Amino acid sequence: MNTDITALEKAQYPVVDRNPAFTKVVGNFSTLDYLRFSTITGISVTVGYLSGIKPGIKGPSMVTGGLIGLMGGFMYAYQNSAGRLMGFFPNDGEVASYQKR
């Protein structure tokens, strides 16, 4: 499969890595990325618990909501980290660990 990451609208910030790997993007998670992930996971677990009381399945409903929240929170954090590393988002921190390292 021929692949091409070239985006339609060019990055507006220094490109630290144009196609960062999965492990590299994950290792690039900042404290803000872990804050977004934890907030989305906690809100999802809360909604699962509160919506599950009436049917009587608050536990399993918490599990289902937490799974949805874990998926969405990881997705949001990965999005932010990869976009920073590709220069689509403000990434002064990534540029610091690039000039220095």
């Binding site: 404290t31 907030t39 906690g42 809360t46 618990y49 509160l50 608050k58 918490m62």
Partner: peptide
């Protein structure tokens, strides 16, 4: 002396994490 509903305790912790994470998210953005 102790709250025994473990699912409710987990949900309380989840709500606390949501609130604290929202505060930190605002403070660091």
């Amino acid at each position: 002396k102790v709250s025994e509903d473990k699912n409710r305790n987990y949900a309380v912790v989840a709500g606390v994490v949501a609130i604290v994470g929202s505060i930190g998210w605002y403070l660091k953005a």
